[PDB]
Amino acid sequence: MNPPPPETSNPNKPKRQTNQLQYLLRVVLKTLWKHQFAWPFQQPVDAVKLNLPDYYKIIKTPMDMGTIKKRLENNYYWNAQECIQDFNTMFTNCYIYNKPGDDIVLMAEALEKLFLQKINELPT
């Protein structure tokens, strides 16, 4: 089975809006979402549909851009670092599960390069 997806809305977790988190949603998430290579990263890895029975034995901190979109939209994060950590966790999961030069890794690396370029322009 797949696990349930990561939590995206927590009534008990405090919320706030910052210009960095607005940038992470309206610039960073939006730009990566529209990238040609984004499709494997737009939702949790469906290990059932993809026949990857070891995926969630190896990856115990799953992350994906559909979850990050929901966390941003729901004001789930208190600070930008929490959202940047989620993007980094998602790329790292892909790297750990696969091998250098695999198609999925080249795709993740291109998205990560674009992510880092956008993060360099994160406002104050």
Ligand X SMILES: Cc1cc(C)cc(Nc2nccc(-c3c(-c4ccc(Br)cc4)ncn3C3CCNCC3)n2)c1
Measured from the CB atom, is 20 or 67 closer to ligand X? Answer: 67
The reply to whether 41 sits near ligand X by the rule CB under 6 A is yes
> What is the closest distance, in whole angstroms, from the C-beta atom of residue 92 to ligand X in the complex?
9
Which residue in the set 15, 30, 50, 82 belongs to the binding site for ligand X (CB under 6 A)?
Answer: 50
Question: What is the secondary structure of 8-73 as a DSSP string?
Answer: ---TTS-----HHHHHIIIIIIHHHHTSTT-GGGSS---TTTTT-TTHHHH-SS---HHHHHHHHH
Residues 71-100 that bind ligand X (CB under 6 A): 90, 93-94, 97-98
Give Cα 53 to chain centroid, integer Å: 21
Q: Considering beta carbons, is residue 33 or 78 the nearer one to ligand X?
A: 33
CB of 19 vs ligand X, minimal distance in Å = 27
- Note whether 46 and 40 are within 8 A (CB): no
Q: What's the rounded Cα separation, in Å, for the pair 50 and 28?
A: 28
Residue 68 is a binding residue for ligand X (CB under 6 A): no
Residues that bind ligand X (CB under 6 A): 40-41, 45, 50, 52, 64, 90, 93-94, 97-98, 103-104
